[PDB]
Amino acid sequence: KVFGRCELAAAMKRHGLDNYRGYSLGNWVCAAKFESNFNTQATNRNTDGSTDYGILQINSRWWCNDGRTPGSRNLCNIPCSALLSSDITASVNCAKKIVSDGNGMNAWVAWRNRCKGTDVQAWIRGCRL
């Protein structure tokens, strides 16, 4: 599913991401935009052989099991395919584990490079939330 910007914001809000560990909703929407262009089916292979999955591009080296990333962990305890669902619950629940891991949203390279220190509230302006 390709979300609309406000549709995604609402979904994320309902799943407890607004201000989760102090990151306002616009941060999450901004990261999704640049990670996946709001497409839950997005996948991208990394140089190390791991793959990033879903709307928030969660990596198989640490967070999910894809059966093809040797020596990896599965810290969210989920098949990576669950992250591609139109239902974002598994991505959100896993993202809450990731953002709590020490480095905050800096875990998402696109957040650090494209969202951090920008007016992220712009991503939810105009939405009914």
Residues recognised as catalytic: 35, 52
Contacting residue, 36, 40, 51, 72, with Na ion by CB under 5 A: 72
Residue 79 backbone phi and psi in degrees, to 5: -65, 140
Total length of the chain: 129
Q: Are 123 and 5 in contact (CB under 8 A)?
A: yes
**Number of residues binding to Na ion, judged by CB under 5 A:** 5
- Closest CB to Na ion among residues 57, 60: 60
59 touching Na ion, by CB under 5 A: no
Q: Which residues contact 113 (CB under 8 A, 6 or more apart)?
A: none
Q: How far is the CB of 42 from Na ion (least distance, A)?
A: 18
**DSSP one-letter string for 64-105:** -B-S-STT---TT-SBGGGGGSSSTHHHHHHHHHHHTSSSGG
51 touching Na ion, by CB under 5 A: no
65 touching Na ion, by CB under 5 A: yes
Q: How far is the CB of 46 from Na ion (least distance, A)?
A: 12
Q: CA 23 to CA 20: how far, in whole Å?
A: 5
Selected range binding Na ion among 9-17, 39-47, 73-81, 108-116, rule: CB under 5 A = 73-81
Which residues fall in the annotated binding site?
A: 101
Would you tell me which residues interact with Na ion (CB under 5 A)? 60, 65, 69, 72, 74
